[PDB]
Design a protein around this ligand. Structure first.
Ligand SMILES: O=C(O)[C@@]1(O)C[C@@H](O)[C@@H](O)[C@@H]([C@H](O)CO)O1
Ligand SMILES: O=C(O)[C@]1(O)C[C@@H](O)[C@@H](O)[C@@H]([C@H](O)CO)O1
Lengths: 254, 238
């Protein structure tokens, strides 16, 4: 049950400059994720970053921070260094709440950490349903599909599953009514310190570089992943300035 | 090794498929069809025919009735060669049959590398990708894997570099008669209903599928001297 949260907060970002420090109602984005993790019930909350400026701000708001190499290509790779640096036991459960999920409800953090034992996987994540076609067709929205038991089939930026009879000869994209079969992946993962170590022992894959999805290294290497549907999202992932206005809107509506 | 080919149908491609199933080493070759005419034409070139119900939404479902009518043992390996695959040699057909035990799976299939970018966006070309060992991750009419950098507003399919990251699924499956009976025992899935891909029912039910990457070879064993004389014979009578 017990677990520790590590929040990867890379500074550089093509889409959103200074992303982690992006302002949201008076506080940088990372602070929201942080204060959220505090109420999750985690035993320790660590902001993993690669920028001195981000480190200062994170310290200014009382967050323990671990500096990491700017050479990492993903949060999972970054957390591999934190786990080693801070000698966190292999059996310790780590929940990676990516620094761009400022609205993730605290209750689901505990849920994902528990899903490792419940579903017998070395890695577990979450997802919310997609209701609008615009979001489904958005490459920034990562889609995921599982089998009857929740075990992931594939993660992709591509439109899956493909609705052949509705999409092939689609006359008007606005007249699109999705069927209840789409899931947007939340940028949150649960995995033991030891599994993270195994992750970086595996070699980078072409698959993860094509899609730009760190979790594909896991599927590529025959490792099972469980994803569970959460209810009441309300917002997921901020990669663009627009998603940023999406979060401000969902908050303005107190 | 020792498998029987069952062809769900519904010079003709029907015959060209029969002769490939024969040169594949199969012990028995059955032509499953729900049409009297087709069944009639299959008895023309000496093919075993098994009339099946029209109430089958997929070749795999049609094969279930066959396995029932012919009382084929559950452990008997059946190779479903959906239709014609001119660039697919018969030696590969046996390998897919042997892959069931090799990779320890109940369903085995194959795929070819995509060389034309237009295929990726052709909904009628089914794309597939596997893990490092060949176990399928997903099948889709949508392009997968998705190349973020290149597809970000691609205004010309001709600029797409394939990097050998893409595979086209070929409609040929290997699976024991017992597994086929299992297939039709599982309820139809939302997944297969949307994508219109029968194999998705297997994935959704937590089963693994192994796919082999095959090399496209020129039409091998398309006709025999005899078949060609007959063709010329028809033409000459004019
Ligand atoms: O927002 C992200 O940084 C990212 O896109 C990184 C990816 O590797 C992947 O983890 C993704 C999640 O699938 C959530 O979209 O988040
Ligand atoms: O639609 C197809 O392509 C079909 O003939 C039936 C599908 O269920 C599926 O088996 C498909 C194969 O994936 C080959 O494309 O063949």
């Amino acid at each position: 049950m017990s677990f520790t949260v590590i929040i990867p907060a890379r500074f550089a970002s093509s889409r959103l400059p200074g992303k982690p420090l992006a302002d949201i109602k008076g506080k940088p984005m990372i602070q929201h994720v942080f204060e959220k993790a505090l109420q999750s019930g985690a035993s320790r909350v660590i902001i993993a970053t690669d920028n001195e400026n981000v480190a200062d701000v994170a310290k200014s708001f009382g967050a323990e921070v671990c500096m990491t190499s700017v050479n990492h290509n993903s949060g999972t790779e970054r957390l591999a260094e934190v786990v080693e640096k801070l000698a966190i036991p292999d059996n310790e459960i780590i929940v990676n709440i990516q620094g761009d999920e400022p609205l993730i409800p605290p209750v689901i953090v505990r849920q994902v950490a528990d899903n490792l034992a419940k579903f017998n996987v070395n890695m577990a994540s979450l997802a919310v349903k997609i209701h609008d076609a615009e979001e489904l067709f958005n490459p920034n929205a990562v889609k995921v599909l599982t089998d009857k038991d929740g075990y992931v089939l594939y993660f992709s930026r591509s439109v899956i599953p493909y609705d052949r009879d509705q999409f092939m000869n689609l006359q008007d994209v606005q007249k699109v009514q999705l069927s209840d079969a789409y899931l947007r992946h939340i940028g949150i993962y649960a995995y033991r310190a030891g599994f993270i170590k195994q992750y970086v022992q595996w070699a980078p894959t072409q698959l993860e570089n094509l899609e730009k999805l760190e979790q594909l290294r896991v599927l590529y290497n025959g490792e099972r992943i469980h994803v569970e549907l959460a209810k009441e999202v309300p917002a997921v992932g901020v990669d663009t300035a627009e998603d940023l206005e999406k979060v401000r809107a969902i908050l303005a509506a107190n």
